[PDB]
Symmetry: D2
Subunit: 326 residues, 4 copies
């Protein structure tokens, strides 16, 4: 059997309530050891060994935890045969994509969480973790980048997103679909991501204790320019617009961001719309203003890529060029 290291960070998989019944619960309490215990079967498939990195609800996830995860994995890659990262569901699409862009290990790295608390009746965490270890222990999972395993499905870290607020089936790769499905502990992979991931990115976070400041602004009718101005007034390195439709902006937000782009702030057009690309060649002429189109990357994921891109280059043409490749 392979050695699988479980790096715990918290989440509802690590949450507990007051009842098998009430929905009231608190995230990120139970330790990694109690999680492993709940799934004795793992020892049929892998020698697991858990490490508690943090124990938070991932609505409080941040750069420090990310850099800690990437470095730990990069450092211990030849000490283990693969990784499972227990994580909360809310920002798991952010961390999966961050690790997808920064981990230089091509051993399987697999994230997992739970939408029902461990104390819940019919809790989903035990079986999810079991299938995460299955995925991590499977040689065929290697070299497909960072993975998210939820609801019997292997999803790539770039395109996986949280689709529903409460459904156990919430995670879906809404643009290009999953990579493979898990049935009775076996995966039939029929796909792999074509965009560059893990060991093929230029991003090196070994010597990095902080990432460039990137904020997100939302677009809607009558939208105030005050959030955009605040991120400018503070001098963020980059700003991601959660636009309307195909990455469009409300007029006052556009004005603030068009000025900021001239004065060096990286500006990325993404979209609040849950699927489909923010393309070039539509209603916004990006080259004219020095904006970047985020492609299929939703706003929280475009932020991850823009942050990493700002450690390599200011140049809008180069940043766009990164968004066309990662």
């Amino acid at each position: 059997l392979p050695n699988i290291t479980i790096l715990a960070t918290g989440g509802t998989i690590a949450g507990g309530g007051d009842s098998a019944t009430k929905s009231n619960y608190t995230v990120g309490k139970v330790g990694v050891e109690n999680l492993v215990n709940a799934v004795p079967q793992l020892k049929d498939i892998a020698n697991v060994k858990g490490e508690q990195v943090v124990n938070i609800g991932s609505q409080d996830m941040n750069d420090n935890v990310w850099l800690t995860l990437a470095k730990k994995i990069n450092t211990d890659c030849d000490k283990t045969d693969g990784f499972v990262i227990t994580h909360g569901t809310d920002t798991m699409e952010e961390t999966a994509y961050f690790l997808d862009l920064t981990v230089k290990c091509d051993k399987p790295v697999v994230m997992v969480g739970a939408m029902r608390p461990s104390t819940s009746m019919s809790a989903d965490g035990p079986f999810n973790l079991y299938n995460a270890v299955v995925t991590a222990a499977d040689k065929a999972s290697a070299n497909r980048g960072v993975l998210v395993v939820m609801n019997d499905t292997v999803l790539d870290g770039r395109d996986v997103t949280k689709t529903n607020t409460t459904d156990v089936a919430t995670f879906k790769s809404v643009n290009y679909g999953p990579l493979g499905y898990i049935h009775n502990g076996k995966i039939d992979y029929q796909r792999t991501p074509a965009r560059k991931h893990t060991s093929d990115t230029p991003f090196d976070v070994s010597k990095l204790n902080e990432l460039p400041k990137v904020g997100i602004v939302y677009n809607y009718a009558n939208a105030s320019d005050l959030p955009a101005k605040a991120l400018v007034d503070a001098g963020y390195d980059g700003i991601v617009s959660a636009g309307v439709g195909n990455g469009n902006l409300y007029k006052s937000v556009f004005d603030t961001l068009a000025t900021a782009a001239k004065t060096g702030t990286a500006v990325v057009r993404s979209s609040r719309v849950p699927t489909g690309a923010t393309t070039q060649d539509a209603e916004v002429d990006d080259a004219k203003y020095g904006f970047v189109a985020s492609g299929t990357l939703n706003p929280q994921k475009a932020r991850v890529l823009l942050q990493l891109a700002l450690t390599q280059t200011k140049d809008p043409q180069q940043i766009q060029q990164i968004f066309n490749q990662y």
Copy 2:
């Protein structure tokens, strides 16, 4: 034949049918004054026609549709439509959508269902319909409860109607209003700044909607700031950037301690519409929370 009025407002998209251009703006520039003008326009001319089709941009159609769904006091069908392909394109989708929207607006069965959106052969309710894809002609979906009806060969097979209140069942009248209360929206994500929330609070907004993570959750910075703002009188509604499902009560956030309002299935931009309207009546979060339980 019935009389149907087409009120044009903009968009890629550009019975006895009568046509009128009220405004012409890309819907990404939609704003309070157009909404006020548009609701006033429809309430004034309701008696003069049998139904309205409103041609509109797709980017914020789900926002206008819900605003009208809450402010129109006319029970006659009001049917919004747009188009994802330019009208000069091969296989332009606008012509058939407008046709189907007039059919919907003329059908006696469409009445009393509130403001509707007709796209890609489907009749969708103003409350649940949202834009799910940035470019697909099939983008508009009612992602939580599904469509009201399907249209084939000019006939409608209606099998659903909204239980939440709309149109003439709402108390919201904007007839003598020239402004709406200021409501902004802030995004949550890992390591998020509270600067957006701080700026709107410092500007003394009437309300802030939180595009939360998962089941309406907030980054600790943003959540400290909004809890502080909620106690200082700023209305705060927890919504979710997650495209489907409700922000509920009784999950991780104890709303009653903080004075927060759970948005339910209303996404952030739709939650903003209802908050705005609720702030013309009450400002107590507990009275606002029932508002969000009925509309």
Copy 3:
């Protein structure tokens, strides 16, 4: 607490938390896997619910998942009880890791005990969602979230034991239907034939040779038929056999006024009813009429 009866039939009789929301009574009606469901269990279930309706406040039926969407629609059309009737099952074994059965059964009782669930027809409760008996269908082969109402959506979502209902089925059900199974020991014989390239007409013709009352076609696209199958079903309709055009395609209506001249042959267009669901309405249709027009009206109204 409401009095709630649990009728077991099998699936994947005597979950402690059930006692906090209803006084639960059980009896084992039958004991089959639902891939083997049949007319006799449907008649039994319907007569059972109609006789005991006044002895209880509502019903929960445990059922296998494979044909739950068929029994739900049949009960939807034959149960004359307006009180809540809720079907539930599980996609993972009860001994499974993260078994879904316990929380599904809990939420079903929550639904059967909610007075707001009455007058909405027969209901399917799976994966925190309340689904109408007509539109609900199994969409994935293994997913716990398999059951969806794929044309018109759910009636409500269940959270923290509370149901926020926002919809109710417009089509007729329960006490608004003419179908009465109380007098019948058997149902008209209706079979289903599949369409695909180079499709054989042997399966349809075998049904005609056995003298079936009706035949449902799972057609291609908008109810279309391979040439030999349509020759075969044209011949059946000529001899008086009812023919309903449905579709193998998983969502959308089989419409009239399309590629097939239904009134010429006497065919019926199934609307959004998928093949196995159209068989239900046609069997019940045939207890009331054999006229193709009357049957089209029924597929339009229920």
Copy 4:
């Protein structure tokens, strides 16, 4: 400009309404095609794809394999009803790795907002994109490139009906440009063991449906015809009504190859009789038919269903 050959079989793209417009009428109605490809057009048949059959399939395989060297890519206009079957058949039998794109239309050409013209335009864009080669046989519909194996018709009327419901599309078309981000892993085209080049027949494979109370007469009818194979459209995870299973067990015992598939639109029929995997019944038929051209062993047929 690339040389693109269009092979017309009919369908609503060429067809309440009645395949009757010619290939050259479809090509001539999209003059924009002249600015992306030199279009060459041939009429294989002109039928509704509800009437698609083995003969047309054998002819299309043979035409593409024979003329592969003479053009740069192929677009096959086709009815939408069985386009998902023809595409998988070609996916498994054409030995040409140049782009092969199938396309149809859900609205008649005279309909307003008719989807045909832009679909065809996008089909030719895709067939001219050299990046489309080595991806297998493709279906291009509603701005989306879909692998021939997973694509299926999901709605009876929707212009957006075609979807790769288990693993998703290969690419999206925006302003005449494809961003490919996936390719199929299961083997296809020149990587398959099947040669139909000298066949005028295919083995006989039928499909029987499962439901409550289900009659065994359709399966028996196919056992009585001596079919080479039967695909079961089972309930849930490939399960069978009792009486149908009894007859298929009889068929299997006497040499008929039996594949379990599912009437359920998404997800695999698992092992744990041949298990169909994510292949729906009409796709299972295609592969089973081809498998019976080289073996009758159930066990060797399963290996085939695990590779293609």
